[PDB]
Design a protein around this nucleic acid. Structure first.
Lengths: 63, 100, 146, 207
RNA sequence: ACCUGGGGAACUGAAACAUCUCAGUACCCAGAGGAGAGGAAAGAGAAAUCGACUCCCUGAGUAGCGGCGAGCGAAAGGGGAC
RNA sequence: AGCGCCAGAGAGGGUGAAAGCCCCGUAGGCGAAAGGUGGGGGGAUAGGUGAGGGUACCCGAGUACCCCGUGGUUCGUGGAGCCAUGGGGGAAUCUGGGCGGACCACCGCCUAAGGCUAAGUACUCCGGGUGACCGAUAGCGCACCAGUACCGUGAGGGAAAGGUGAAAAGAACCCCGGGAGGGGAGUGAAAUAGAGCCUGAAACCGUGGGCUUACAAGCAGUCACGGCCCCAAGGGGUUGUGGCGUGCCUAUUGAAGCAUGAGCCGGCGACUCACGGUCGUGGGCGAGCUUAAGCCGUUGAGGCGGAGGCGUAGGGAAACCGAGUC
């Protein structure tokens, strides 16, 4: 009955308009990896290919 | 209750089948079976009963109840459905526009 | 018309398939023949492997959910004037909602493409663009003091 | 677009005629019409098909046999659906059948209804009703000279309950108050016949 | 059967399991009656606001809650019944 | 088959088969001495009915309130209030006291620690009405003398079994036989309708007839010729030789397999429905589309109802901006 939306997924992914699933970059999350490398820089958002078709289906109502 | 039907201790006319049309006197109303009797099917048995007291029995038997729906009341004419008049006191039944 | 033949027109197909036959989908039934395809599987969607899903991606979505709940804050429904010039006269909230966009959507902020024509248009907000755009001839109705 | 109906002589004045756009012989759509019928004939469905499920049955839950050293097949309770006495598996459960057919269609449907019938000239707007105090005779008499000998089925609709009674008993007639018009009955009968008043409300229902 | 109160599980789910879940469910007990409960604001919550309570439709799978897992999930406001 | 007729009544059942007009009924319309019920419309008690000016007398206590331990709420210790409350401390009476999510301060809401209160709501032992509900392995466990028989110390478990015929007219009498059963006779439309009696399938046991078998080795059949038996430029039935031929299902890399299952037959027996969602598709309408609950009609008429919900703008954690935005 009325599928419930998967909070966690909602808490970590924003689905654009054309239907793309976008989330952050694993690896830098407050380093915890530590002492830089100019890598930290390269951390904006990204497109999750093929796994979004699934990601998406978990937010059927929240859209 | 609601057991009541047409004819009573009086003159009827069959209209069944094997006796289709055969005016006859009273049937001795059932009614806890809805049977008449009349004088129509008067089948004969093997008269002896449960106890052959006094010699044998006979083969001139008696009337066969006969379903009540197959007979009809009658007067100056044929068949005719019952009907009711007030009388201005009591009550009685009279055939369709003929009376009695 | 005629009780006879008024039925579907080349596509009712209320003919689902039955996995219990002897030819077509059978025995194993509408495909299967193995196990854990026997009376329900884990998901898949999010779940399984028993690996990590992709609940691996970090929840950046910050500033998210305190406790008493959401914060009653003024929302502003957006409407371009390319959908506005659709009519003319005196266009203001209420006049919308009851038509086109809004519906208690609250604050009405115009803006947009197209090229709206002159007609004092009330609102709650306009774009540095939206203004200038109809500045050529229009209205500066706005805010509230009550 | 072909729409001339058939006004029905009131007294001495002859038979005039009216008309109305696609609200008359226009573009009849077989499907849509049907769609409306299904809906009609489904919503009215008195869903009450009940059968007791496994647990729904009235047996104990004891495990008939020890389960492991009897040779006999392994088993649960005599309620198991492979147990005769047992409960049905996917039996029918009392459920509703209605759904909300698009209003804008529910009507466009009554349109095609009246329409068709009229295009085949079986539509007839009446007016003159000499039938009183609900009398089958009087009505039958009327229809006779009214041009309805009882060959084709007749959907009679009028705001006159007395006339209603009149034909309320004729095997070849379906008497129906005006507000009850519906594509089914329209289609159901071979000839639609209605009071001017009636035709108005049906018109009010969509002009 | 339905209802209110007092007590109150586990299997299961989490593809182990302990928080969590199932669930204040099953059941046990007392009591009420044609219903029971609730009910005239030490209320609601942002509206120059509303005005006992209960029931339905929305609001809303929103707000939130959660080994932020599995999963759980309102209220105000708006329609109605009364 | 031929002439009619009633109809506010052409619902239904029943009568030897399929009746509006034969019977019971149906539409419609009447009925209560008696006992329940009964503001729907009205009578009567109970009770309730104003405005200023002054003291500074009352306004619910082991209560509020604070602290420790918990419960309820979406709230799981969280920034964690509020509402409850076992323990400890423990006030004030309108210059009073609580609440608006720690805490202050503003601003505003409300009057705790006494009680009652219809309706709208829930359920179905019970009465009635309907069914794209079942029709005796179904439907309730019970259509029948069933919560019985039987089982169990007990709690408890828990069956099977419906149908003669229109009507008993249910088989007088004679014969065989101890009886039972039968043979005639007789009833009946029918007795291969004769009594756990409609129809009576299959497995299974028989009698009679046709072809066929006692030197031959087989998943039992198939192909081919020839012979025998019922209709004739053909067909059936059988089968003497000859040729060819490792069962069915399941599970497997691989089964005739000495792997699983099955004695045989007949019944029962497994991909469903509800709500969300996603593609496809058949339609309505289109910058728009659509109603929920409920009210009004219907008594197998459908209307009404815009609260609400999708869609019309996206970016950004957010403030915010906007055909842009980060």
């Amino acid at each position: 009955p009325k599928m419930k939306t998967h909070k966690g997924a909602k808490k970590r992914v924003k689905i654009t308009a054309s239907g793309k699933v976008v989330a952050m970059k694993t690896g830098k999350r407050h380093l915890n990896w530590q002492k830089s490398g100019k890598e930290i820089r390269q951390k904006g958002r990204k497109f999750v290919l093929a796994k979004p078709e699934a990601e998406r289906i978990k937010l059927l109502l929240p859209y | 209750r609601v057991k009541m039907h047409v004819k009573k201790g009086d003159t009827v006319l069959v209209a069944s089948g094997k006796y289709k049309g055969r005016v006859g006197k009273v049937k001795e109303v059932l009614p806890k079976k809805y049977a008449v009797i009349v004088e129509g099917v008067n089948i004969v048995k093997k008269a002896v009963r449960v106890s052959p007291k006094y010699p044998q029995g006979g083969f001139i038997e008696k009337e066969a109840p006969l379903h009540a729906s197959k007979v009809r009341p009658i007067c100056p004419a044929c068949g005719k459905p019952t009907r009711v008049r007030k009388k201005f006191l009591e009550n009685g039944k009279k055939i369709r526009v003929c009376a009695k | 018309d005629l009780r006879p033949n008024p039925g579907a027109n080349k596509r009712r197909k209320r003919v689902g398939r039955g996995p219990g036959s002897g030819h077509g989908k059978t025995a194993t039934r509408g495909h299967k023949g193995q196990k854990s395809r026997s009376g329900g599987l884990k998901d898949p969607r999010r779940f399984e492997g028993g690996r990590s899903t992709t609940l691996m991606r970090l929840p950046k979505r910050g500033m998210q959910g305190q406790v008493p709940g959401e914060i009653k804050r003024p929302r502003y429904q957006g409407v371009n004037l390319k959908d506005l010039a659709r009519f003319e006269g005196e266009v203001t909230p209420e006049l919308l909602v009851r038509a086109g966009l809004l519906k208690k959507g609250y604050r009405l902020k115009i803006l947009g493409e197209g090229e709206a024509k002159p007609l004092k248009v009330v609102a709650h907000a306009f774009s540095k663009s939206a203004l200038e755009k109809l500045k050529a001839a229009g209205g500066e109705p706005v805010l509230l003091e009550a | 677009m072909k729409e001339v109906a058939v006004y029905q002589i009131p007294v001495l004045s002859p038979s005039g005629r009216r008309e109305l756009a696609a609200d008359l012989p226009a573009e009849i759509n077989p499907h849509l019409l049907w769609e409306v019928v299904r809906w009609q004939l489904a919503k009215r469905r008195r869903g009450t098909a009940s059968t007791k499920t496994r647990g729904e049955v009235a047996y104990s839950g004891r495990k008939i046999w020890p389960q492991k050293h009897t040779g006999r097949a392994r088993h649960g309770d005599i309620g198991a659906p492979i147990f005769v006495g047992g409960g049905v598996v996917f039996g029918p459960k009392p459920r509703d059948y209605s759904y909300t057919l698009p209003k804008k269609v529910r009507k466009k449907g009554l349109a095609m209804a009246v329409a068709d019938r009229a295009r085949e000239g079986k539509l007839l707007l009446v007016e003159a009703f000499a039938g009183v105090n609900g009398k089958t005779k009087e009505f039958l008499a009327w229809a006779k000279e009214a041009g309805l000998d009882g060959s084709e089925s007749v959907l009679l609709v009028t705001g006159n309950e007395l006339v209603r009674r009149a034909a309320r008993n004729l095997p070849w007639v379906v008497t129906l108050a005006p507000e009850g018009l519906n594509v089914y009955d329209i289609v159901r009968t071979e000839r639609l016949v209605m009071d001017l008043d009636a035709w108005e409300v049906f018109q009010n229902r969509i002009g």
